[PDB]
Design a protein around this motif. Structure first.
Motif, short mmCIF file in Angstrom:
data_model
loop_
_atom_site.label_atom_id
_atom_site.label_comp_id
_atom_site.label_asym_id
_atom_site.label_seq_id
_atom_site.Cartn_x
_atom_site.Cartn_y
_atom_site.Cartn_z
N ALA A 1 0.84 -1.19 0.00
CA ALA A 1 0.00 0.00 0.00
C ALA A 1 0.87 1.25 0.00
N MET A 2 2.04 1.14 0.63
CA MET A 2 2.99 2.25 0.67
C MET A 2 3.55 2.55 -0.71
N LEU A 3 3.76 1.50 -1.51
CA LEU A 3 4.44 1.64 -2.79
C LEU A 3 3.49 1.69 -3.98
N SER A 4 2.25 1.28 -3.76
CA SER A 4 1.23 1.36 -4.80
C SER A 4 0.68 2.78 -4.93
N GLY A 5 1.19 3.69 -4.11
CA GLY A 5 0.72 5.06 -4.11
C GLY A 5 -0.62 5.18 -3.41
N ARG A 6 -1.12 4.07 -2.87
CA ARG A 6 -2.41 4.05 -2.19
C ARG A 6 -2.29 4.63 -0.78
N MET A 7 -1.10 5.12 -0.45
CA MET A 7 -0.84 5.68 0.86
C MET A 7 0.40 6.57 0.79
N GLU A 8 0.42 7.62 1.60
CA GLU A 8 1.57 8.51 1.68
C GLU A 8 2.72 7.83 2.40
N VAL A 9 3.93 8.02 1.87
CA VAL A 9 5.14 7.52 2.49
C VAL A 9 6.01 8.72 2.84
N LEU A 10 6.66 8.64 4.00
CA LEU A 10 7.48 9.74 4.48
C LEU A 10 8.94 9.46 4.17
N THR A 11 9.51 10.30 3.31
CA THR A 11 10.90 10.20 2.91
C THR A 11 11.69 11.42 3.38
N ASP A 12 13.00 11.25 3.51
CA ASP A 12 13.88 12.34 3.92
C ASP A 12 14.64 12.90 2.72
N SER A 13 15.60 13.78 2.99
CA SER A 13 16.36 14.45 1.94
C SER A 13 17.14 13.47 1.07
N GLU A 14 17.55 12.35 1.65
CA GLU A 14 18.42 11.40 0.96
C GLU A 14 17.66 10.24 0.31
N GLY A 15 16.34 10.23 0.44
CA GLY A 15 15.50 9.27 -0.27
C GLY A 15 15.18 7.99 0.48
N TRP A 16 15.27 8.02 1.80
CA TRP A 16 14.94 6.87 2.64
C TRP A 16 13.51 6.91 3.15
N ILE A 17 12.73 5.87 2.88
CA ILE A 17 11.39 5.77 3.44
C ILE A 17 11.51 5.52 4.94
N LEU A 18 11.04 6.47 5.73
CA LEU A 18 11.13 6.37 7.19
C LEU A 18 9.97 5.59 7.78
N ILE A 19 10.28 4.71 8.72
CA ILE A 19 9.27 3.97 9.47
C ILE A 19 9.63 4.00 10.95
N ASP A 20 8.71 4.50 11.77
CA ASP A 20 8.95 4.63 13.20
C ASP A 20 8.61 3.32 13.90
N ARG A 21 9.40 2.30 13.60
CA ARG A 21 9.29 0.99 14.24
C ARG A 21 10.68 0.44 14.49
N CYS A 22 10.82 -0.47 15.45
CA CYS A 22 12.10 -1.11 15.68
C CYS A 22 12.47 -1.99 14.50
N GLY A 23 13.73 -1.91 14.08
CA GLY A 23 14.19 -2.63 12.91
C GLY A 23 14.78 -3.99 13.24
N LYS A 24 14.62 -4.42 14.49
CA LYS A 24 15.18 -5.69 14.93
C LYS A 24 14.66 -6.85 14.08
N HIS A 25 13.34 -6.93 13.94
CA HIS A 25 12.71 -8.04 13.24
C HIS A 25 12.27 -7.67 11.82
N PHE A 26 12.61 -6.46 11.38
CA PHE A 26 12.18 -6.02 10.06
C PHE A 26 12.85 -6.86 8.98
N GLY A 27 14.09 -7.26 9.24
CA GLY A 27 14.83 -8.14 8.35
C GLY A 27 14.10 -9.45 8.18
N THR A 28 13.45 -9.90 9.24
CA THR A 28 12.67 -11.14 9.21
C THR A 28 11.42 -10.97 8.35
N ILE A 29 10.83 -9.78 8.38
CA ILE A 29 9.65 -9.49 7.57
C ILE A 29 10.00 -9.55 6.09
N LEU A 30 11.11 -8.93 5.73
CA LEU A 30 11.55 -8.89 4.34
C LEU A 30 11.79 -10.30 3.81
#
Ligand code: HG
Ligand code: HG
Ligand code: HG
Ligand code: HG
Lengths: 97, 99, 101, 101
Positions: A28-57
Motif C-alpha cells: 500500500a505504501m508503494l502502490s501510491g495508495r498511501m503517503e510515504v514519508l521520505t527524507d532528503s536522501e531518499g529513505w522511506i522512514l518507518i517509526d518501528r524497531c528494525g530488529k525483526h524487520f529483516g525477518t519481515i523482508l
C-alpha cells in the motif's frame, strides 16, 4: 527497481517486487495508495524497531521464514507482523504459540 | 579484481576469485551469465538479507565454513544457500539438521 | 552533515545511522558528534582500527539496549575487549558478569 | 602514525594502522620498515600467502597486547604456527604455555 527503508535507524535495501508480493502495508505504501514519508536522501522512514524487520523482508521474499525460539521473540516478531499487515506471518506466529 | 556488493543494505567487499571459486549463482552474476544492477556508488545490489552473506562468502573462499549453533540460523543460512545455489553448503545445512 | 553513517571497522563494512550510534553514551557517539578526531577516506568511510567481528553486536546493543551474548567464554571475552574499547558501559558489565558464572 | 594499512591474507581482507603494526617487534613491522619485500596489487593491498583464519587474532594481539586464545589444541597449534611465522614472539609464548597439559 530498488527501495531503501530506514526502520527505526536500521537500514534496509529491497525491491518493489518483494514489497508488493503479498497484500501488506508495504504494498500500500508503494502502490501510491498511501503517503510515504521520505527524507532528503531518499529513505522511506518507518517509526518501528528494525530488529525483526529483516525477518519481515525474508518472509515476503521466500513466503516463509524460520521463527524465533523464545516466546518473547515470537511476540516481538508477531507485533511487527500485525503492524505491517503480514497476515500469513501473524497467523504462523500465533500458531507457533 | 575486487567486487563490492550491497546485499539487502549490508555492504560487503570481496574478490572475484572468491565469488567465482565454486559453481553457484554468484559466479554466474560475474561470469556475465546474468544481469547486474549497481547503484550510484558502484555497489552491486542484491535483494537478499546480508545477515548470513558473510558466511556464504567464506564458504566459497575456503570450501568450508563453521555453521551456526541454533537450528534457526542454520535454516536461515539454508534459505540463502538455496537461493544462491551453493549446493555444497545446502547439503551440509540439510545434514546439520539431524535432530 | 548526514544522519546515515558508513564505518570501516577493521575491514568489516557497516552501514548505520546517527540514531543508533547516539542512543547510549560511548566512544562512537563522541566520534560522530565531531567531538573527537576521525579519519575518513576518499569515499567517506570513517576508519576504525578494531576487528569488526563483534561490531555488529555492538550496534545491536546500542539499538535494542540488549543483545544475546555468545556461548563460548572466548567470544564473550572478545566482545568485552570491543565493548571496553568503545566505552560501552552497559555491555561491559553484562559481559564481565557473564565471565563470573 | 595513524595511516591505514590494508592486507589481503589468503583472500581475507583486513584494515589496520601503522601504529598497530609497529607496536611490537614482528614480521609485520619489518614489512613496513622496508626490511622485507611486500607484494601489493593495483588497489594497494599487501598480499600475504597465508590462510587468513587467525590473522584477525594476530592483529588484535598487536592492538590490545592480549587476546582470547582458542579452546581446542588444534586451533592453538594453528594460531601458534601463524605467530611463529609472523614472528609475534609474545603470542607464541602464551600459545606454547596454553598447550601445557
Ligand atoms: Hg535477516
Ligand atoms: Hg527492538
Ligand atoms: Hg586455515
Ligand atoms: Hg577478530
Amino acid at each position: 527497481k530498488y527501495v531503501k527503508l530506514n526502520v527505526g535507524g536500521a537500514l534496509y535495501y529491497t525491491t518493489m517486487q518483494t514489497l508488493t508480493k503479498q497484500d501488506t502495508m508495504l504494498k500500500a505504501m508503494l502502490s501510491g495508495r498511501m503517503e510515504v514519508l521520505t527524507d532528503s536522501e531518499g529513505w522511506i522512514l518507518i517509526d518501528r524497531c528494525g530488529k525483526h524487520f529483516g525477518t519481515i523482508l525474508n518472509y515476503l521474499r521466500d513466503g516463509a521464514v524460520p521463527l524465533p525460539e523464545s516466546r518473547r521473540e515470537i511476540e516481538e516478531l508477531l507485533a511487527e507482523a500485525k503492524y505491517y499487515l503480514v497476515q500469513g506471518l501473524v497467523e504462523e506466529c500465533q500458531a507457533a504459540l
